[PDB]
């Protein structure tokens, strides 16, 4: 039949995919250090012989919202949030390094510093931070310097042991990977530490998802979705009527 | 009246193409820069500003454009179909083809280089400039041209379109064919 049936179907299909991207945003409102995902549609025309009447649209992710997340003051010593722009460099389960903004850190039984996702926290030597096992008081600095008190030591024996690797690259050069870690679009790009990134210890950075912004985008995808499915029915209606040209 | 900075913003797309179709603008500010393509079709604009820069292609089909001043930079093509241009200035940096179909064009710059196709279809031009170089297809159909210069260069096909050519260039290397 007419190709407008599939031209509208290819549009309704993308609206559902855009709806899925907004659904993931609202599910992650309470998530810690979550960067909102933007949804956009690209107009692609079928170039060739004939009148230029058919143009497809596909939904794609143009970028992410890198605005500062909501800061939650918790009073916990091992809670860190990046003041302004900046990232925390961590290595995932496989070992590939990446940037994260979740500062819900913790100390394991061996002293290795991890975050809430389990990623190991990189240090001054581009290696995971391993603090002494018998600690007494962890006091993270504003610049990322970790000053710990050995167990049984006097309060005046406060010494720095490591400095968290904070990286502030261009946000437009970062893409979210398959596990929520932002990495460079260009492969084999070294993550260079920055001396301007600051860590506000004792607070946790929340999500930056604008709940109303997603809701008002939802009510427009539904209407656009319903208009296209009416086009599918009216293209079906036209073909059924034209079935009476072979009756003879 | 004339286009302002705020009026410019209301005729620009996401990638930076200025659309002035049917808009009542008479003159553009000097030193004008366009991020992408420029469209001044059907406009009462009779003159393009000096120092004009277009990051894309200039579209002036069926417009009132008459004068383009030298120094204009156009990255894409120039489409002046149906406009009121009578002469082409010297020193225009054109990154694409030049379509001058159905224009009152009479004179062309000497040793003009067209990086794309050239059209003089149905134009009152009497003779082509010496040393003309065309990297694409040349359409002279329906024009008043009947004598080619001593030397010319066309890297594509040459379409006569109906006009009769009597004096062919002495030095001519053609990458394509000649069609009547």
């Amino acid at each position: 039949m007419d190709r407008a049936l599939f031209l509208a179907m290819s549009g309704a299909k993308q609206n559902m995919q855009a709806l899925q991207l907004r659904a993931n945003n609202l599910a992650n409102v309470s998530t810690t250090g979550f960067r909102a995902d933007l949804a956009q549609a690209r107009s692609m025309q079928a170039y060739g012989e004939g009148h230029p009447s058919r143009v497809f649209s596909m939904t794609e992710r143009p970028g992410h919202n890198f605005a500062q997340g909501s800061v939650i003051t918790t009073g916990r010593d091992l809670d860190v949030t990046i003041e302004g722009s900046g990232w925390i460099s961590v290595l995932d389960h496989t070992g590939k390094e990446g940037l994260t903004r979740n500062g819900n850190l913790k100390v394991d039984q061996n002293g290795m510093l991890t975050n809430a996702s389990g990623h190991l926290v990189l240090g001054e030597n581009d290696a995971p931070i391993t603090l002494p096992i018998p600690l007494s008081k962890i006091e993270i600095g504003r610049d990322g310097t970790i000053s710990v008190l050995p167990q049984g030591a006097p309060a005046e024996e406060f010494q720095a042991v490591d400095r968290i690797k904070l990286v502030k690259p261009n946000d437009q050069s970062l893409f979210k990977d398959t596990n929520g870690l932002f990495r460079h679009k260009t492969p084999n790009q070294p993550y260079e530490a920055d001396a301007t990134v600051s860590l506000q210890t004792g607070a946790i950075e929340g999500s930056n998802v604008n709940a109303v912004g997603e809701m008002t985008a939802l009510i427009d995808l539904q209407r656009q979705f319903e208009m296209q499915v009416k086009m599918m029915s009216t293209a079906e209606e036209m073909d059924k009527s034209s079935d009476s040209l072979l009756r003879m | 009246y004339e286009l302002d900075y705020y009026s410019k913003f209301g005729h620009t797309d996401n990638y930076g193409n200025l659309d002035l179709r049917n808009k009542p603008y008479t003159q553009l500010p000097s030193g004008f820069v366009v991020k992408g393509n420029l469209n001044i079709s059907q406009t009462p604009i009779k003159k393009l500003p000096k120092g004009l820069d277009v990051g894309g292609s200039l579209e002036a089909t069926n417009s009132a454009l008459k004068t383009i001043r030298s120094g204009t930079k156009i990255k894409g093509y120039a489409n002046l179909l149906g406009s009121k241009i009578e002469s082409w200035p010297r020193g225009i940096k054109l990154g694409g083809y030049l379509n001058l179909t159905d224009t009152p064009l009479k004179t062309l710059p000497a040793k003009l280089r067209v990086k794309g196709d050239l059209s003089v279809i149905r134009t009152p031009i009497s003779a082509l400039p010496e040393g003309l170089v065309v990297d694409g297809n040349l359409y002279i159909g329906g024009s008043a041209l009947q004598v080619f210069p001593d030397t010319m260069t066309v890297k594509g096909n040459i379409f006569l379109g109906g006009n009769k050519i009597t004096k062919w260039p002495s030095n001519l290397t053609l990458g394509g064919a000649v069609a009547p």
Binding site: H51 | N62, Y97, D102, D135, N137
Partner: peptide, 24 residues
Amino acid sequence: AGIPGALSNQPPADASIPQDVAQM
């Protein structure tokens, strides 16, 4: 001819004049 602002279905090339449209 007819309409003055018809489109062209050929992909942009910026070097070849589109002959799909009635370029007169």
